[PDB]
Amino acid sequence: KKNIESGVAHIHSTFNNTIVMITDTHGNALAWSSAGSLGFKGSKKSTPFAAQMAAEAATKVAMEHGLKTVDVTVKGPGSGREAAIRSLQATGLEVTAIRDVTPVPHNGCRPPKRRRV
């Protein structure tokens, strides 16, 4: 609805799950697809194969509301962050800006411990 067609996508991908969400210019949220939401569970959500079809099921419900141009907000250092963008162009959008905004601190707090395994 209202056919803005100038959206902002969002990319977040840990070592164990990924979420893509496509919003407005600012953006207020429109449609989002998660690797857990597409039937996958547990540990297999880490793989880059989910990042294709999560992006596809995001873009379908996205451009039902009418969507041509897009911004690419990249958080979440994981695995399929590049596959999500490459399948994002494969369903016909206007990726032209790559910002891998990874929030790094300046030694504020302390990390958790090692994993004595």
Binding site: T47, P48, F49, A51, Q52, G80, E82, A83, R86, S87
Partner: peptide
């Protein structure tokens, strides 16, 4: 080009 998610 469907297992290409882990083939780039």
């Amino acid at each position: 080009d469907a297992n290409r998610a882990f083939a780039h």
